[PDB]
Enzyme design. Structure first.
Site, PDB file in Angstrom:
ATOM      1  N   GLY A  44       0.764  -1.230   0.000  1.00 57.02           N
ATOM      2  CA  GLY A  44       0.000   0.000   0.000  1.00 57.02           C
ATOM      3  C   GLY A  44       0.798   1.285   0.000  1.00 57.02           C
ATOM      4  CE1 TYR A  48      -0.371  12.182   3.526  1.00 59.47           C
ATOM      5  CE2 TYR A  48      -0.291  12.004   5.922  1.00 59.47           C
ATOM      6  CZ  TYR A  48      -0.025  11.472   4.669  1.00 59.47           C
ATOM      7  OH  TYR A  48       0.586  10.229   4.564  1.00 59.47           O
ATOM      8  CG  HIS A  53       9.336  11.094   8.436  1.00 66.19           C
ATOM      9  ND1 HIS A  53       8.824  12.349   8.688  1.00 66.19           N
ATOM     10  CD2 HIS A  53       8.906  10.752   7.191  1.00 66.19           C
ATOM     11  CE1 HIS A  53       8.123  12.757   7.643  1.00 66.19           C
ATOM     12  NE2 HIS A  53       8.146  11.805   6.722  1.00 66.19           N
ATOM     13  CD  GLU A  76       8.360   9.632   3.099  1.00 70.50           C
ATOM     14  OE1 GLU A  76       7.232   9.119   2.992  1.00 70.50           O
ATOM     15  OE2 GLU A  76       8.568  10.590   3.860  1.00 70.50           O
ATOM     16  CG  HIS A 101      10.884  14.853   5.023  1.00 75.17           C
ATOM     17  ND1 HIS A 101      11.414  13.678   4.525  1.00 75.17           N
ATOM     18  CD2 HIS A 101       9.539  14.660   5.067  1.00 75.17           C
ATOM     19  CE1 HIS A 101      10.445  12.803   4.318  1.00 75.17           C
ATOM     20  NE2 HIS A 101       9.296  13.363   4.652  1.00 75.17           N
ATOM     21  CB  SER A 134       1.711  12.593   0.389  1.00 79.72           C
ATOM     22  OG  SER A 134       3.061  12.178   0.359  1.00 79.72           O
TER      23      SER A 134
HETATM   24  C1  LIG Z   1       0.285  16.804  10.281  1.00 81.40           C
HETATM   25  C2  LIG Z   1      -0.235  15.928   9.144  1.00 81.40           C
HETATM   26  C3  LIG Z   1       0.954  15.636   8.258  1.00 81.40           C
HETATM   27  C4  LIG Z   1       1.794  14.408   8.392  1.00 81.40           C
HETATM   28  C5  LIG Z   1       1.452  13.414   9.477  1.00 81.40           C
HETATM   29  N1  LIG Z   1       2.844  14.219   7.561  1.00 81.40           N
HETATM   30  C6  LIG Z   1       3.114  15.172   6.613  1.00 81.40           C
HETATM   31  C7  LIG Z   1       4.076  15.272   5.607  1.00 81.40           C
HETATM   32  C8  LIG Z   1       5.108  14.447   5.417  1.00 81.40           C
HETATM   33  N2  LIG Z   1       6.078  13.775   5.373  1.00 81.40           N
HETATM   34  C9  LIG Z   1       3.942  16.461   4.872  1.00 81.40           C
HETATM   35  N3  LIG Z   1       2.836  17.079   5.402  1.00 81.40           N
HETATM   36  N4  LIG Z   1       2.390  16.257   6.429  1.00 81.40           N
HETATM   37  C10 LIG Z   1       1.334  16.587   7.209  1.00 81.40           C
HETATM   38  O1  LIG Z   1       0.669  17.652   6.999  1.00 81.40           O
HETATM   39 CL   LIG Z   2       2.790   9.389   2.095  1.00 78.22          CL
HETATM   40 NI    NI Z   3       7.581  12.230   4.716  1.00 76.55          NI
END
Ligand SMILES: CCc1c(C)nc2c(C#N)c[nH]n2c1=O
Ligand SMILES: [Cl-]
Ligand code: NI
Ligand SMILES: [Cl-]
Ligand SMILES: [Cl-]
Ligand SMILES: [Cl-]
Ligand SMILES: [Zn+2]
Length: 338
Positions: free
Chosen positions: A163, A170, A181, A183, A269, A281
Site C-alpha cells: 500500500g 493530509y 523521518h 520514508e 524531513h 502524498s
Molecule cells: C500533520 C499531518 C501531516 C503528516 C502526518 N505528515 C506530513 C508530511 C510528510 N512527510 C507532509 N505534510 N504532512 C502533514 O501535513
Molecule cells: Cl505518504
Molecule cells: Ni515524509
C-alpha cells in the site's frame, strides 16, 4: 552537482512538465537529490482539480489531537484520537480563535511562533486518509499513477508493495507537525498541496542523515534503546536552533498551495502546517533507490511496520549483483552525490 546541498526549486514549462519520470531524472541530473527535498512549481495553466467545493463533505474518520511534550527545542509527541468530523467541520475548527494561525510578519516570524507555542493548545489533524482528489483524466503528475519501479514489480511480477504506492490525504491546521523521518524503506515521496495555507519543511541532506540519527540518539537515549530505528515512529521533534547549535547541515523551505515537494531516498524531513490546508502524498521509487532499500535500517520493535522485500528489485534491475547480494557479499557505501 549541487555541492552545497541546498534545496532546489524547479519551474518547468508545460512541455517539460508533461512527463514526470523524465523530469525527475532531469532534477537529479542537476543534483536536486543532494538536498533531500526539492520543490516543483507547475506551470500556472495546469490544474489537477477544477473545483474543491465538494471536498467539504469528505469525512475525516479519525482526527488526531497532537500532544507535544518537551522543552529547549526537543520534544516527543503522542496522539489522542477524536471522533470523526467532516472537512467542513475541521475547517471551521481550524479557523476558530483557539486554533487559527497567529498574526505574523513573515515566514521566519511564524516559524519562531511555531517553536515557541508547541506546548500550549494541542492542534488537530487528519492523516493517512486513503484516496486522491485529482479530477478523473488528469494525466500529468498524477500521484495515484506515477508509473515508477514500484508499479512495475507490482503489475509485472506480482510483488506486494504494501500500500505504499497509493495516495493519501493530509488535512492540516496551524501548528500541526510532521516529526523527523525518512520514508518507509527510505523511499521517495511526492506531496502536492491542493489548497489552503502553506506547509513549511526542514530537510537534512542524505549525506548527513547519519548525523541527525546520532544527535537524536544522544538526546532521546530511552527512545533509542527501545528501537534502533525509533525516528520511524514519527514522534521526535528537533528544532532548527538545536540543529544549528550542533552543526547539523539542513535547509528550510515553505510550500505554497499548488506546489509539489519531492523527498529523496534517506532525506530526513520535518515540518509544520501554517493553517487549514489539504495535501495529497504517495511514495515511489527509481532504480537509484534500490541500493538505499537494501540498506534501510528497519523498525525493530513493532511487528506491522512496512517492509518490502528487496529481492525482486535486485534480481531485475541489478542482475550483475544479485547472487553476490544473496550471498551476503554485496557490501558497499552509498554515494549520495550520485
Ligand atoms: C500533520 C499531518 C501531516 C503528516 C502526518 N505528515 C506530513 C508530511 C510528510 N512527510 C507532509 N505534510 N504532512 C502533514 O501535513
Ligand atoms: Cl505518504
Ligand atoms: Ni515524509
Ligand atoms: Cl495572534
Ligand atoms: Cl500560536
Ligand atoms: Cl532512527
Ligand atoms: Zn520501532
Amino acid at each position: 552537482l549541487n555541492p552545497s546541498c541546498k534545496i532546489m526549486t524547479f519551474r518547468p514549462s508545460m512541455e517539460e512538465f508533461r512527463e514526470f519520470n523524465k523530469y525527475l531524472a532531469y532534477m537529479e541530473s542537476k543534483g536536486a537529490h543532494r538536498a533531500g527535498l526539492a520543490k516543483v512549481i507547475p506551470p500556472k495553466e495546469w490544474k489537477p482539480r477544477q473545483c474543491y467545493d465538494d471536498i467539504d463533505n469528505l469525512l475525516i474518520p479519525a482526527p488526531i489531537q497532537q500532544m507535544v511534550t518537551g522543552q529547549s527545542g526537543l520534544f516527543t509527541q503522542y496522539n489522542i484520537q477524536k471522533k470523526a468530523m467532516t472537512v467542513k467541520e475541521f475547517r471551521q475548527l481550524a479557523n476558530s480563535g483557539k486554533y487559527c494561525t497567529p498574526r505574523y510578519l513573515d515566514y521566519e516570524d511564524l516559524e519562531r511562533k511555531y517553536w515557541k507555542n508547541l506546548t500550549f493548545v494541542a492542534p488537530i489533524y487528519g492523516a493517512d486518509i486513503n484516496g486522491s482528489i485529482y479530477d478523473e483524466g488528469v494525466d500529468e503528475w498524477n500521484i495515484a499513477r506515477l508509473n515508477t519501479v514500484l508499479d512495475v514489480v507490482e503489475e509485472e511480477c506480482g510483488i506486494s508493495i504494501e500500500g505504499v504506492n497509493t495516495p493519501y490525504l493530509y488535512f492540516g491546521m496551524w501548528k500541526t507537525t510532521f516529526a523527523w523521518h525518512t520514508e518507509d524503506m527510505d523511499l521517495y515521496s511526492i506531496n502536492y498541496l491542493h489548497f489552503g495555507e502553506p506547509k513549511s519543511w526542514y530537510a537534512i541532506p542524505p549525506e548527513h542523515g547519519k548525523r541527525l540519527e546520532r544527535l537524536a540518539q544522544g538526546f532521546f537515549p530511552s527512545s533509542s534503546q527501545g528501537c534502533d530505528a525509533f525516528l520511524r515512529h514519527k514522534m521526535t521533534l528537533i528544532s532548527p536552533s538545536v540543529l544549528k547549535k550542533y552543526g547539523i547541515p539542513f535547509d528550510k523551505i515553505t510550500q505554497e498551495a499548488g506546489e509539489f515537494m519531492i523527498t529523496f531516498p534517506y532525506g530526513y524531513h520535518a515540518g509544520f502546517n501554517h493553517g487549514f490546508n489539504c495535501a495529497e502524498s504517495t511514495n515511489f521509487a527509481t532504480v537509484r533507490w534500490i541500493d538505499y532499500g537494501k540498506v534501510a535500517k528497519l523498525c525493530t520493535c513493532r511487528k506491522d511496520m512496512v517492509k518490502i522485500s528487496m529481492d525482486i528489485f535486485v534480481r531485475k534491475f541489478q542482475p550483475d549483483r544479485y547472487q553476490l547480494w544473496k550471498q551476503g557479499k554485496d557490501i558497499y557505501t552509498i554515494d549520495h552525490t550520485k
